[PDB]
Design a protein around this ligand. Structure first.
Ligand SMILES: CC(=O)N[C@H]1[C@H]([C@H](O)[C@H](O)CO)O[C@@](O)(C(=O)O)C[C@@H]1O
Length: 628
């Protein structure tokens, strides 16, 4: 949906120039005080109690002003609320402030890390030194009580402790200046470790991200050895199948993501999954924004939730806030969660007692409020999509395949299965069985498990780069596997396209693919190398086709065996290829009036290089996988 889903609603929880907070004067007296703006939100669940954390910007929305950390907690899922001032600032001057809260929840305790400043009027990365800054850690404890029927709760906040004395003066050569958390909800690793994603500023004004953790519930803190590239900020982390996943903000470029199997010791870019998928705007050269990255279990399946504005207006406007769901294989757009073309910003998401909630910013004239939202309709959609992934995966994993001369043979591979095109298809659309990325069609006629092509441009386009702003099939450039069952219906005049991957840019170059000619021979394409024909085929016969691409290599299989040339390098340079799209048949909106008279059924796409036996399994069972 392009707007807050029907059946969903929200309230202006933190209302600008209206809501008051229990401010404490120097002498101890407490007076309710108006607040210009409320920014940088985070909502979490502590032992059944909702806790909303945010910046209370008293006089103005600017970063350099009087700020304190406000809090609003609840025990009745948002019916009633209580308000406190979690952390005070130093009171050293008109601009003293504490900001950018990062939060971790373990047991009934809250661990809050923030940046504290005294007098500076310029931004942190641009300070002369670090004399004005301090990294503060605050611990909060939640206690539940109860009168007759009605439950109540209190929250006690301890005295702030500084981590400065633990900040090394240098990292592998690099001279340090300041550091803060990455903002947002953090985690408690399965081994019990408290894991903080942090952003570091060096002396020379550069920025990068790193991991800061504790094995002893807050006593000590260690800094992992690994790190990101320069330019990464406001990072968010979660735990997935044994590894840590780090999702960074990147002003003026696409978002970088890394993996780590050793609590941060070594980092590898996630080129085969999520890296470079999300960005800051259509052109990717605008200011970026914060994002939430949280792991949850829906209908018995562990998945990942990601948020981020589209920013169609550019700069700091941050409009049209979306929500994504991924299983580290497929990536689904749950729609827009903000209203119309309003201005949003930072955000937060929480799954509690089978209900979905959100806390985010709304901006008008640079005065900020914080809305509390109920994702009634979004969760519905989400629950449906998971049931599909679950159902299809198991189905494919239950088929009894032939036994190979050495009950059943090897199972049909589902690990790394990203997309599937089969029987279902309507209008100019070929439907994605996994409900994420459909393929555009032209000049086709439906057949069991696929389509038959006839006419100028007959074919299908599976969008890669052509997806636009968000590039969900970015993994293809690093590695991929394409599968398909085919038949050739009519003899071509010379050479004709059947299936492959094409590149952005001049001419109509291909990365890898397969073509057929007038002599009944296959014509494989391996990068820019001339396509010399080989082998032999017959009209109307069903053939298994497979395309492999890994380690910059390429291979093409027919009937389970490789064709001559298979194993050759397909791209020179350290620069990644830029796949425009996958092509099935011979689609085209311009140029040569291609008319590939072929029929294609059951196209499968994986995010990894399938092994030899896995290809055998597919070749011997292609008659059992179709969706009828
Ligand atoms: C400490 C601090 O000022 N953080 C602020 C960041 C910093 O500019 C980046 O960290 C620069 O690296 O940007 C903001 O202005 C923003 O984009 O909304 C808000 C946030 O409060």
């Amino acid at each position: 949906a392009a707007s807050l889903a029907p059946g969903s609603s929200r309230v202006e929880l933190f209302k600008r120039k209206n809501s008051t907070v229990p401010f404490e004067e120097s002498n101890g007296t407490i007076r309710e005080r108006v607040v210009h703006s409320f920014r940088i939100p985070t909502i979490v669940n502590v032992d059944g109690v909702m806790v909303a954390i945010a910046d209370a910007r008293y006089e103005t929305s600017f970063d350099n002003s009087f700020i304190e950390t406000a809090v609003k907690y609840s025990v009745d899922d948002g019916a009633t609320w209580n308000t406190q001032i979690a952390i005070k600032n130093s009171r050293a001057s008109s601009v003293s402030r504490v900001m950018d809260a990062t939060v971790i929840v373990k047991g009934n305790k809250l661990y809050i890390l923030v940046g504290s400043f005294n007098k500076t009027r310029n931004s942190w990365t641009q300070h002369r030194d670090g004399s004005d800054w301090e990294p503060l850690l605050v611990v909060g404890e939640v206690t539940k009580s109860a009168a007759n029927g009605k439950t109540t709760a209190t929250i006690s906040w301890g005295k702030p402790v500084s981590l400065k004395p633990l900040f090394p003066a240098e990292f592998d050569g690099i001279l340090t200046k300041e550091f803060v958390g990455g903002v947002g909800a953090a985690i408690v690793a399965s081994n019990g470790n408290l894991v903080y994603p942090v952003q570091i500023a060096d002396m020379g004004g550069r920025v990068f991200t790193k991991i800061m953790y504790s094995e002893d519930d807050g006593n000590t803190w260690k800094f992992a050895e690994g790190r990101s590239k320069f330019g990464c900020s406001e990072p968010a982390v979660l735990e997935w199948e044994g590894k840590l996943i780090i999702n960074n903000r990147v002003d003026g470029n696409r978002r970088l993501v890394y993996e780590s199997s050793d609590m941060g010791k070594t980092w590898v870019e996630a080129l085969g999954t999520l890296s470079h998928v999300w960005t800051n705007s259509p052109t990717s050269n605008q200011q970026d924004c914060q994002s939430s990255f949280v792991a949850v279990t829906i209908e018995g399946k562990r998945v990942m939730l990601f948020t981020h504005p589209l920013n169609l207006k550019g700069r700091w406007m941050r409009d049209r806030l979306h929500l994504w769901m991924t299983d580290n294989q497929r990536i689904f757009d749950v729609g827009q969660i903000s209203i119309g073309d309003e201005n949003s910003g930072y955000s937060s998401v929480l799954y509690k007692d089978d209900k979905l909630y959100s806390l985010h910013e709304i901006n008008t004239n640079d005065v900020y409020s914080l809305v509390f939202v109920r994702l009634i309709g979004e969760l519905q959609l989400m629950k449906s999509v998971v049931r599909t992934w679950k159902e299809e995966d198991n189905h494919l994993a239950s088929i009894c395949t032939p036994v190979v001369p050495a009950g059943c043979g090897a199972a049909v591979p589902t690990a790394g299965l990203v997309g599937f095109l089969s029987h279902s298809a309507n209008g100019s659309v070929w439907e994605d069985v996994y409900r994420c990325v459909d393929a555009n069609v032209a000049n086709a006629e439906r057949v069991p498990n696929g389509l038959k092509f006839n006419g100028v441009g007959g074919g299908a386009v599976w969008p890669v780069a052509r997806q636009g702003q968000t590039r969900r099939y970015q993994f293809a450039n690093y590695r991929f596997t394409l599968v398909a069952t085919v038949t050739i219906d009519e003899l071509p005049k010379g050479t004709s396209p059947l299936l492959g991957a094409g590149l952005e840019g001049p001419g109509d170059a291909k990365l890898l693919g397969l073509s057929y000619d007038k002599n009944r021979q296959w014509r494989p394409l391996y990068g820019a190398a001339p396509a010399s024909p080989t082998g032999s085929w017959e009209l109307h016969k069903k053939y298994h086709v497979v395309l492999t691409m890994a380690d910059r290599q390429g291979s093409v299989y027919v009937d389970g065996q490789p064709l001559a040339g298979s194993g050759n390098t397909v791209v020179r340079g350290a620069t990644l290829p830029d796949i425009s799209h996958f092509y099935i048949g011979g689609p085209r909106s311009k140029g040569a009036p291609t008319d590939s008279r072929v029929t294609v059924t059951n196209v499968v796409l994986y995010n990894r290089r399938l092994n030899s036996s896995e290809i055998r399994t597919l070749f011997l069972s292609q008659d059992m996988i179709g969706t009828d």
